[PDB]
Design a protein around this nucleic acid. Structure first.
Ligand SMILES: O=c1ccn([C@H]2C[C@H](O)[C@@H](COP(=O)(O)NP(=O)(O)OP(=O)(O)O)O2)c(=O)[nH]1
Ligand SMILES: [Mg+2]
Ligand SMILES: [Mg+2]
Ligand code: NA
Ligand code: NA
Length: 326
DNA sequence: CCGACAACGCATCAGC
DNA sequence: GCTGATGCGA
DNA sequence: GTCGG
């Protein structure tokens, strides 16, 4: 929070570019700068000092001076006043509503929580669920609750098949005291990059978690990726816990490290690390790390036996999970 | 100056 | 139906 | 919006 004011400003600007402008690259540039400034161990006194950090350019340097002198940014001040932008930005907060459907809804005259509620029939499944838990999905999840959720997931998964290995990644694995959701990496010896000796692997787990009323709704569900909702059980007279987002990713067991690396993030850390690999001549995904031969075609998967092995290939000192929160 | 910007699963749709 | 582009996720 | 060749 040393430079919380500037990073918030950049984040707002980033959200503006992505939601209203539908300018994905500007969005990422602003996020990158906010991230780099956020890890800067000094209270920024000027734009110049900031323009020294990679990702902070001249344009952002100027905004930082304006922000420092007045404590605000006219560009954002105006944006906040534009009803259209204010509308689009609000709708994009509903899980399942992106920058495109948000603009489309505004056109259709649907621009408020009430509107959304009176036109539920005009939303797809995901959006319907997003609206249902609009408030809840805006709440953070205390690590304490994350531990309680981890317990149920791991115990339930063990009950389905003792050979299942469920690992909670995301911000939780990075050690955050609070998470936006629960991310679970799943593996089973029957599913390898070599073969799928058992079907319904993911389904079975989803099934078991629903039977115990942990998973309550499903945003999307395929063979290896589940996106849904869950809620911890409450005691007698106790108010119910809020509904929470839960992502489950089944990955080939022999590809666990590339998978766990990816699912631990952060998303920006993955961006930077993947960008670096490419500069080093490699391509990294949640499955493997392959070399890049001149032509521009990925090669065969290099052998990996740990997350560190991945770091070594790209000549990066190992960074524990707690230090990947960019 | 100007190409590149990380990578990919699932839902949805248009065209054949 | 299939496939491939697009939205969304974050 | 920023960067590197
Ligand atoms: O754009 C993305 C988003 C996520 N990810 C990876 C890293 C991230 O940590 C992980 C889980 O996704 P979440 O959206 O749950 N992010 P995270 O758990 O880090 O933060 P939060 O506490 O918001 O959930 O998936 C990417 O690689 N790219
Ligand atoms: Mg998460
Ligand atoms: Mg998640
Ligand atoms: Na800079
Ligand atoms: Na949204």
């Amino acid at each position: 929070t040393l430079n919380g004011g500037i990073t918030d400003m950049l984040t707002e600007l980033a959200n503006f570019e992505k939601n209203v402008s539908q300018a994905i690259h500007k969005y990422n540039a602003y996020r990158k700068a906010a991230s780099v400034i956020a890890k800067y161990p000094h209270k920024i006194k000027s734009g110049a000092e900031a323009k020294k950090l990679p990702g902070v350019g001249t344009k952002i340097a100027e905004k930082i001076d304006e922000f420092l002198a007045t404590g605000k940014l006219r560009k954002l001040e105006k944006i906040r006043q534009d009803d259209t932008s204010s509308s689009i930005n609000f709708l994009t907060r509903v899980s399942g509503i992106g920058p495109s459907a948000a603009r489309k809804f505004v056109d259709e005259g649907i621009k408020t929580l009430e509107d959304l509620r009176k036109n539920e029939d005009k939303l797809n499944h995901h959006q319907r669920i997003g609206l249902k838990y609009f408030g809840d999905f805006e709440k953070r999840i205390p690590r304490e609750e994350m531990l309680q959720m981890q317990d149920i997931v791991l115990n339930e998964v063990k009950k389905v098949d003792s050979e299942y290995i469920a690992t909670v990644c995301g911000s939780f694995r990075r050690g955050a005291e609070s998470s936006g959701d629960m991310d679970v990496l799943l593996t089973h010896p029957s599913f390898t990059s070599e073969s799928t000796k058992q079907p319904k692997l993911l389904h079975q787990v989803v099934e078991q978690l629903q039977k115990v009323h942990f998973i309550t709704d499903t945003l999307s569900k395929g063979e290896t990726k589940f996106m849904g909702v869950c809620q911890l059980p409450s005691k007698n007279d106790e108010k119910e816990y809020p509904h929470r987002r839960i992502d489950i990713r089944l990955i080939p067991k022999d590809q666990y490290y590339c998978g766990v690396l990816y699912f631990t993030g952060s998303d920006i850390f993955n961006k930077n690390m993947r960008a670096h690999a490419l500069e080093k001549g490699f391509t990294i995904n949640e499955y493997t790390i392959r070399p890049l031969g001149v032509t521009g075609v990925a090669g065969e998967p290099l052998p990996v036996d740990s997350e560190k092995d991945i770091f070594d290939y790209i000549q990066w000192k190992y960074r524990e999970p707690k230090d990947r929160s960019e």
